[PDB]
Amino acid sequence: GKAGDKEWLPVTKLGRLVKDMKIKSLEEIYLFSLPIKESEIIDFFLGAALKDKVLKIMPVQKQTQAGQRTRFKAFVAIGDYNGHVGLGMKCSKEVATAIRGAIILAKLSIVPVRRGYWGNKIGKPHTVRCKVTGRCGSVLVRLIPAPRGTGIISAPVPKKLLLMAGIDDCYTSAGGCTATLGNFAKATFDAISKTYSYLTPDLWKETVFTKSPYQEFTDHLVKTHT
């Protein structure tokens, strides 16, 4: 018999507006393009379906004056299957410390990915709207959208990553080094945050340049500091 607890603490203007039901979703901050230093803000908003994936706990080491010194380089990714994925890397002396560290680093680093259609125009997005790509040490991970029923045709490392996006229909073609798998996923993480980065003609309709809910709530933000 053993149980865990949670206590909220705001360290910023956001986490007060998080806890006071003024900011209700990451989608606001995703529109607001603001930093987040509290992974519990994410846990305040979703707290569910955010699949933790311990990719590789690889033992890396440095030689010292007395023999060597090693550490566990754990690769823990987060994501719900909805258009939001994350990743954490924790280099700890233990495994589970490097796991549970990179769990929370995955939690804090969850990002939105922009899903779309292949040649479709309706049907609640199933792939990307655009061929996206990314490199991490010469390993180019290019993604190509597919129509429905095709599947995620990938190496097994981006196949889980495209799964966590909800991009269920994608083609791959990768060149580079064949063994460095952490550089595979880090190059793959470049392509999926690139989905918002491509300017669609649907994205030519520009916005009203929202007005910094620091300032919009700065009187409500008066708790001990505005």
Binding site: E27, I29, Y30, L31, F32, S33, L34, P35, I36, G83, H84, V111, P112, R114, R115, G116, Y117, K121, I122, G123, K124, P125, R129, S193, Y196, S197, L199, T200, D202, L203, E206, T207, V208, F209, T210, K211, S212, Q215
Partner: protein, 82 residues
Amino acid sequence: MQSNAGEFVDLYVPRKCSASNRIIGAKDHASIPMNVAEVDKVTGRFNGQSKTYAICGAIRRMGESDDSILRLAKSHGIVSQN
């Protein structure tokens, strides 16, 4: 980014800029609005609503944002001596 006529696919609409015609994305740092107060019209005692202007880090890291809001606050008003 929307789908079929009334149906919206994207999770949100990311912000933009007027200085590089370029979007402000998801968690982009030094990617900020610029709220400049409407000060009123010799009667004085500034009128509320600040004029907003979204600035990305790209025009910031290229050091463009000084003339950019000068192309946004002088050009659109209101500012004395202009």
